[PDB]
Enzyme design. Structure first.
Site, PDB file in Angstrom:
ATOM      1  CE  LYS A  51      -4.158   2.018   1.988  1.00  0.00           C
ATOM      2  NZ  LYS A  51      -3.586   3.376   1.727  1.00  0.00           N
ATOM      3  CB  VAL A  56      -0.645  -0.510  -4.168  1.00  0.00           C
ATOM      4  CG1 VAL A  56      -1.125  -1.652  -3.281  1.00  0.00           C
ATOM      5  CG2 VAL A  56       0.199  -1.051  -5.335  1.00  0.00           C
ATOM      6  CE  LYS A  63      -9.685  -7.940  -5.186  1.00  0.00           C
ATOM      7  NZ  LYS A  63     -10.458  -7.018  -4.312  1.00  0.00           N
ATOM      8  CB  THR A  92     -11.143 -10.956 -24.999  1.00  0.00           C
ATOM      9  OG1 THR A  92     -10.570 -11.569 -23.837  1.00  0.00           O
ATOM     10  CG2 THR A  92     -12.615 -10.676 -24.738  1.00  0.00           C
ATOM     11  CB  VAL A  94      -9.511 -14.181 -31.202  1.00  0.00           C
ATOM     12  CG1 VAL A  94      -9.507 -13.965 -32.688  1.00  0.00           C
ATOM     13  CG2 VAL A  94      -9.528 -15.654 -30.881  1.00  0.00           C
ATOM     14  CB  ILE A  97     -12.745 -11.280 -30.451  1.00  0.00           C
ATOM     15  CG1 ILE A  97     -12.921 -12.054 -31.764  1.00  0.00           C
ATOM     16  CG2 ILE A  97     -13.896 -11.545 -29.484  1.00  0.00           C
ATOM     17  CD1 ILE A  97     -13.226 -13.568 -31.530  1.00  0.00           C
ATOM     18  NE  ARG A 140       7.691 -12.439 -24.703  1.00  0.00           N
ATOM     19  CZ  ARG A 140       7.068 -11.273 -24.586  1.00  0.00           C
ATOM     20  NH1 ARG A 140       5.756 -11.235 -24.417  1.00  0.00           N
ATOM     21  NH2 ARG A 140       7.752 -10.142 -24.640  1.00  0.00           N
ATOM     22  CB  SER A 171       8.832  -4.821 -26.281  1.00  0.00           C
ATOM     23  OG  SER A 171       8.568  -5.589 -27.447  1.00  0.00           O
ATOM     24  CG  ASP A 183       5.277  -2.379 -31.935  1.00  0.00           C
ATOM     25  OD1 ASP A 183       4.129  -2.616 -32.320  1.00  0.00           O
ATOM     26  OD2 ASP A 183       5.766  -2.848 -30.890  1.00  0.00           O
TER      27      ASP A 183
HETATM   28  N1  LIG Z   1      -2.667   1.183 -25.214  1.00  0.00           N
HETATM   29  C1  LIG Z   1      -1.525   1.418 -25.858  1.00  0.00           C
HETATM   30  C2  LIG Z   1      -0.916   0.408 -26.595  1.00  0.00           C
HETATM   31  C3  LIG Z   1       0.284   0.651 -27.259  1.00  0.00           C
HETATM   32  N2  LIG Z   1       0.866   1.882 -27.150  1.00  0.00           N
HETATM   33  C4  LIG Z   1       2.141   2.187 -27.834  1.00  0.00           C
HETATM   34  O1  LIG Z   1       2.344   1.276 -28.875  1.00  0.00           O
HETATM   35  C5  LIG Z   1       3.504   0.498 -28.640  1.00  0.00           C
HETATM   36  C6  LIG Z   1       3.380  -0.887 -29.280  1.00  0.00           C
HETATM   37  O2  LIG Z   1       2.274  -1.593 -28.751  1.00  0.00           O
HETATM   38  P1  LIG Z   1       2.484  -3.112 -28.277  1.00  0.00           P
HETATM   39  O3  LIG Z   1       3.071  -3.830 -29.454  1.00  0.00           O
HETATM   40  O4  LIG Z   1       1.159  -3.669 -27.856  1.00  0.00           O
HETATM   41  O5  LIG Z   1       3.472  -2.978 -27.008  1.00  0.00           O
HETATM   42  P2  LIG Z   1       4.975  -3.512 -26.749  1.00  0.00           P
HETATM   43  O6  LIG Z   1       5.501  -2.597 -25.669  1.00  0.00           O
HETATM   44  O7  LIG Z   1       5.859  -3.501 -27.989  1.00  0.00           O
HETATM   45  O8  LIG Z   1       4.793  -4.978 -26.118  1.00  0.00           O
HETATM   46  P3  LIG Z   1       5.062  -6.378 -26.876  1.00  0.00           P
HETATM   47  O9  LIG Z   1       6.425  -6.905 -26.531  1.00  0.00           O
HETATM   48  O10 LIG Z   1       3.987  -7.306 -26.391  1.00  0.00           O
HETATM   49  O11 LIG Z   1       4.883  -6.217 -28.360  1.00  0.00           O
HETATM   50  C7  LIG Z   1       3.639   0.494 -27.136  1.00  0.00           C
HETATM   51  O12 LIG Z   1       4.932   0.175 -26.694  1.00  0.00           O
HETATM   52  C8  LIG Z   1       3.286   1.935 -26.859  1.00  0.00           C
HETATM   53  O13 LIG Z   1       4.406   2.722 -27.219  1.00  0.00           O
HETATM   54  C9  LIG Z   1       0.217   2.893 -26.472  1.00  0.00           C
HETATM   55  O14 LIG Z   1       0.693   4.018 -26.468  1.00  0.00           O
HETATM   56  N3  LIG Z   1      -0.944   2.659 -25.779  1.00  0.00           N
HETATM   57 MN   LIG Z   2       5.235  -4.544 -29.694  1.00  0.00          MN
HETATM   58 MN   LIG Z   3       2.474  -3.848 -31.649  1.00  0.00          MN
HETATM   59 NA    NA Z   4      -8.892  -9.426 -28.731  1.00  0.00          NA
HETATM   60 NA    NA Z   5      -0.734   3.469  -2.270  1.00  0.00          NA
END
Ligand SMILES: Nc1ccn([C@@H]2O[C@H](COP(=O)(O)OP(=O)(O)OP(=O)(O)O)[C@@H](O)[C@H]2O)c(=O)n1
Ligand SMILES: [Mn+2]
Ligand SMILES: [Mn+2]
Ligand code: NA
Ligand code: NA
Ligand SMILES: Nc1ccn([C@@H]2O[C@H](COP(=O)(O)OP(=O)(O)OP(=O)(O)O)[C@@H](O)[C@H]2O)c(=O)n1
Ligand SMILES: [Cl-]
Ligand SMILES: [Cl-]
Ligand SMILES: [Cl-]
Ligand SMILES: [Cl-]
Ligand SMILES: [Cl-]
Ligand SMILES: [Cl-]
Ligand SMILES: [Mn+2]
Ligand SMILES: [Mn+2]
Ligand SMILES: [Mn+2]
Ligand SMILES: [Mn+2]
Ligand SMILES: [Mn+2]
Length: 326
Positions: A51, A56, A63, A92, A94, A97, A140, A171, A183
């Site tokens: 907390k 948090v 929890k 969800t 997929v 969806i 991955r 990422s 990306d």
């Molecule tokens: N709700 C979201 C989703 C995505 N992003 C931007 O889009 C990027 C790419 O999205 P995603 O591929 O889903 O995230 P990653 O960080 O690359 O995670 P992963 O390794 O799963 O691809 C994110 O890093 C973020 O910069 C965002 O601003 N807000």
């Molecule tokens: Mn990504």
């Molecule tokens: Mn992406």
């Molecule tokens: Na989905």
């Molecule tokens: Na807190």
DNA sequence: CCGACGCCGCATCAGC
DNA sequence: GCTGATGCGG
DNA sequence: GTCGG
């Protein structure tokens, strides 16, 4: 990881709230708590200790106390056994969806992978492709494969027009040893905040990547954003690489710094950073950082000549991409 | 207590 | 067809 | 669900 049990619990609760409850703020609250806990460098011994971390609250502390005592959370045990909730959660997974389509499908008696496969005609194009590659999208991507994919994208882009610059973000740019997908931020001097001087700038690139059989399918596509599927070429007699998701975002060239901060993320980092900017009297999007007027209306784009400039405006020390994995 | 919670691109639908 | 809401996604 | 005010 250090507090993996707790962060997993919270992540599962977040998903329930988003997919089943349809409560986006609860979803975001839970993810924020899991993120701050994930970063906390001690093995949490109590809810009170957790907390102390921002995000948090009292309910999560409770929890955490239950989780630590028992190794379980009754609330989740319940949800896990509920047929509607469990079905909605699975659908969800997929791509295409969401909570709404999932609940509607489960209403029509569509609630398993096999059910989806025999009702393709009830899915839209995005959803059809998400189903097609459901299995592959679970996998991955090793960084070594991202490096291979980077070369292909970067070199192919150069062959369409040597003035394009493509930067792998998400990422990958944050230094992850494995990524959920690829990306790509794209720029070209013919597309700026002040004019689009060429048409088809994104299309041309997609076509080229398709032509060499890198891109294999399209989930959605407009003038600045493409969502699709790609695949590395496999060697002779070599088993095929999984199909991967790819996102490509064309950004006005002069607004590279805002676009790259945006597309680098993480998503939680962005929510946190943008929220702080609001607290500080600014609004940040992928194009600009702008001051908030007293009325609460955005003003003129402020000068930006680096990612750092954006952090400065909001009185945050610069954080390298690798330190933005929230 | 309570109002806010990031911000925007693309696909689909309802209404005109 | 256009426009604005909603879904789902970055 | 949390947090500033
Ligand atoms: N709700 C979201 C989703 C995505 N992003 C931007 O889009 C990027 C790419 O999205 P995603 O591929 O889903 O995230 P990653 O960080 O690359 O995670 P992963 O390794 O799963 O691809 C994110 O890093 C973020 O910069 C965002 O601003 N807000
Ligand atoms: Mn990504
Ligand atoms: Mn992406
Ligand atoms: Na989905
Ligand atoms: Na807190
Ligand atoms: N997709 C890209 C990538 C970069 N650039 C240009 O290249 C410069 C910097 O090159 P690079 O090292 O690839 O990007 P950053 O390191 O993030 O930018 P900088 O080092 O200048 O801060 C940026 O100012 C930008 O004008 C661009 O226009 N489009
Ligand atoms: Cl909510
Ligand atoms: Cl549990
Ligand atoms: Cl519940
Ligand atoms: Cl790159
Ligand atoms: Cl803007
Ligand atoms: Cl870094
Ligand atoms: Mn992912
Ligand atoms: Mn495949
Ligand atoms: Mn702050
Ligand atoms: Mn969403
Ligand atoms: Mn408070």
């Amino acid at each position: 990881t250090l507090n993996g049990g707790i962060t997993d619990m919270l992540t599962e609760l977040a998903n329930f709230e988003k997919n089943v409850s349809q409560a986006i703020h609860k979803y975001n609250a839970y993810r924020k708590a899991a993120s701050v806990i994930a970063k906390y460098p001690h093995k949490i011994k109590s809810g009170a200790e957790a907390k102390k971390l921002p995000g948090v609250g009292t309910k999560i502390a409770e929890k955490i106390d239950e989780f630590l005592a028992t190794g379980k959370l009754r609330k989740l045990e319940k949800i896990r056994q509920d047929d509607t909730s469990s079905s909605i959660n699975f659908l969800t997974r997929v791509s295409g969806i969401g909570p709404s389509a999932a609940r509607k499908f489960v209403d029509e008696g569509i609630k398993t992978l096999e059910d989806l496969r025999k009702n393709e005609d009830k899915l839209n194009h995005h959803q059809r492709i998400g189903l097609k590659y459901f299995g592959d999208f679970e996998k991955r991507i090793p960084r070594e494969e991202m490096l291979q994919m980077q070369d292909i994208v970067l070199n192919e882009v150069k062959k369409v027009d040597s003035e394009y610059i493509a930067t792998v973000c998400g990422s990958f740019r944050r230094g992850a040893e494995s990524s959920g997908d690829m990306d790509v931020l794209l720029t070209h001097p013919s597309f700026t905040s002040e004019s689009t001087k060429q048409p088809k700038l994104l299309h041309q690139v997609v076509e080229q990547l398709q032509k060499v059989h890198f891109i294999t399918d399209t989930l959605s596509k407009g003038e600045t954003k493409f969502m699709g599927v790609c695949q590395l070429p496999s060697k002779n007699d070599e088993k095929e690489y999984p199909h991967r998701r790819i996102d490509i975002r064309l950004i006005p060239k002069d607004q590279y710094y805002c676009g790259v901060l945006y597309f680098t993320g993480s998503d939680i980092f962005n929510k946190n950073m943008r929220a702080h900017a609001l607290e500080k009297g600014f609004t940040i999007n992928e194009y600009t950082i702008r001051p908030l007027g007293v009325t609460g209306v955005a003003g003129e784009p402020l000068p930006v000549d680096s990612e750092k400039d954006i952090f400065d405006y909001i009185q945050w020390k610069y954080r390298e991409p690798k330190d933005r994995s929230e």
